[PDB]
Amino acid sequence: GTRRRGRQTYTRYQTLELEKEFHTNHYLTRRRRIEMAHALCLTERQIKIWFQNRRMKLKKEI
Numbered sequence: 001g002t003r004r005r006g007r008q009t010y011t012r013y014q015t016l017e018l019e020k021e022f023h024t025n026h027y028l029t030r031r032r033r034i035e036m037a038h039a040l041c042l043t044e045r046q047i048k049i050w051f052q053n054r055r056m057k058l059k060k061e062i
Contacts, residue, residue: 010050014040018050 010018017040025032028051036047 014042014050018047018054022051022054 017036021028021036028036028047033044033047036042037044040047
C-alpha cells in the first residue's frame with residue numbers, strides 16, 4: 001500500500017532512543033542497526049540517516 005513515503009522528520013521517541021544509543025556507542029554494527037528497527041519500529045536505513053546527519057552535525061567529544 002504505502003511503501004514510498006516522503007518524510008524527513010523524527011519523533012521524540014525515536015530521537016531519544018537514538019540519542020542514548022549514539023551516546024553509549026559511536027559506531028553501529030549491522031546487527032545493532034536491526035535491533036533498533038524493532039524498538040524504534042522503522043527501516044534499517046532510517047537509523048543510518050539519523051546517524052549520518054547527527055554525526056555530521058556534531059564533532060569530537062567535549
